[PDB]
Design an enzyme around this catalytic site. Structure first.
Site, PDB file in Angstrom:
ATOM      1  N   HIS A  22       0.612  -1.194  -0.224  1.00 24.20           N
ATOM      2  CA  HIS A  22       0.098  -0.027  -0.115  1.00 24.20           C
ATOM      3  C   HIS A  22       0.740   1.367   0.095  1.00 24.20           C
ATOM      4  O   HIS A  22       0.717   1.809  -0.315  1.00 24.20           O
ATOM      5  CB  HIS A  22      -0.737  -0.077   1.341  1.00 24.20           C
ATOM      6  CG  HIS A  22      -1.733   1.134   1.502  1.00 24.20           C
ATOM      7  ND1 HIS A  22      -2.779   1.541   0.649  1.00 24.20           N
ATOM      8  CD2 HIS A  22      -1.793   1.562   1.772  1.00 24.20           C
ATOM      9  CE1 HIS A  22      -3.658   2.176   0.242  1.00 24.20           C
ATOM     10  NE2 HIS A  22      -3.097   2.517   1.744  1.00 24.20           N
ATOM     11  N   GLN A  69       4.151   1.605  -1.306  1.00 20.27           N
ATOM     12  CA  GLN A  69       4.643   1.756  -2.528  1.00 20.27           C
ATOM     13  C   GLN A  69       3.989   2.422  -3.707  1.00 20.27           C
ATOM     14  O   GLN A  69       4.123   3.096  -3.677  1.00 20.27           O
ATOM     15  CB  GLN A  69       5.347   0.088  -2.994  1.00 20.27           C
ATOM     16  CG  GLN A  69       6.442  -0.202  -2.113  1.00 20.27           C
ATOM     17  CD  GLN A  69       6.706  -1.928  -2.408  1.00 20.27           C
ATOM     18  OE1 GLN A  69       6.901  -2.265  -3.472  1.00 20.27           O
ATOM     19  NE2 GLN A  69       5.997  -2.672  -1.092  1.00 20.27           N
ATOM     20  N   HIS A  71       0.864   3.803  -2.318  1.00 18.53           N
ATOM     21  CA  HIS A  71       1.021   5.600  -2.567  1.00 18.53           C
ATOM     22  C   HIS A  71       2.036   6.295  -2.965  1.00 18.53           C
ATOM     23  O   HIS A  71       2.009   7.400  -3.928  1.00 18.53           O
ATOM     24  CB  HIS A  71       0.591   5.857  -0.691  1.00 18.53           C
ATOM     25  CG  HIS A  71      -0.573   5.352  -0.502  1.00 18.53           C
ATOM     26  ND1 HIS A  71      -1.793   6.648  -1.044  1.00 18.53           N
ATOM     27  CD2 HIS A  71      -1.634   4.823   0.044  1.00 18.53           C
ATOM     28  CE1 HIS A  71      -3.052   6.738   0.091  1.00 18.53           C
ATOM     29  NE2 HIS A  71      -2.062   5.375   0.529  1.00 18.53           N
TER      30      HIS A  71
END
Lengths: 99, 104, 104
Positions: free
Chosen positions: B78, B80, B82
């Site tokens: 998540h 990475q 974002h």
């Protein structure tokens, strides 16, 4: 596969995705400067890099596949770069209409 | 590194990326409203949050490249995500801002 | 959460995100052509698909944060990947449509 293969796979993808990204950003730069021909040409070249970059079926064909951060990084880079390729026509078009 | 460690680091990347993402989106809102100075200022700020998270990502990837096996974490995934989507937005934000400028 | 349930949920997120993605790009095409009502309608539809996939993701992520070891799922990562990049597309689409509207 094993981690090394997943990783090397990640790298090759990062490779193509990185090239395509550069050309897409260069294309936007060209479009910003009014050189629309260069932009289109740079976009086609980006399209080429993306063409060659191209799991779920593999995982479904059993389970397997070792976790690799480099492999997800490569996929992520490829997908975000494709998102750019998928909207670059509009950014360039807006530049034309603006000029 | 254990899953818990990757998870904690994942949160750290989310903290910086989420902040940068909010700043970039706020810069677009600013540009949309004609406040180009605020837009540029917000991008410069987002850039600082991205640099912090990006160098960490770079370090982590090199650890794996060098042989270290990193455990799986959805939170890290998540983070990475974002970060990378936020980086893309940053890479093209100059163009969205300039476009608002030319029409305004 | 079961490995089966992870792959399943993974596929559901891929389907919703893929569905939202198509609408967003169709929305861009509509705006480029000046069909604004259609473009906005597609974005609203896309946002509704994203909301369902996003809340699934929020729950899944909170499970790991609470200390639950989610089965390693490649399908789920791809779910996450499509969803997060499609959300990025949605953040950007708003401005692309507005730039087209102002150009109109």
């Amino acid at each position: 596969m094993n981690r090394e293969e997943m990783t090397l796979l990640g790298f090759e993808i990062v490779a193509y995705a990185g090239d395509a990204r550069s050309k897409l950003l260069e294309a936007l730069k060209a479009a910003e400067n009014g050189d629309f021909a260069k932009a289109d040409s740079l976009v086609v070249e980006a399209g080429s890099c993306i063409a060659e970059a191209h799991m779920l079926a593999r995982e479904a064909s059993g389970e397997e596949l070792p976790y690799s951060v480099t492999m997800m990084h490569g996929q992520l880079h490829l997908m975000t770069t494709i998102l750019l390729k998928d909207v670059i026509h509009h950014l360039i078009e807006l530049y034309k209409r603006g000029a």
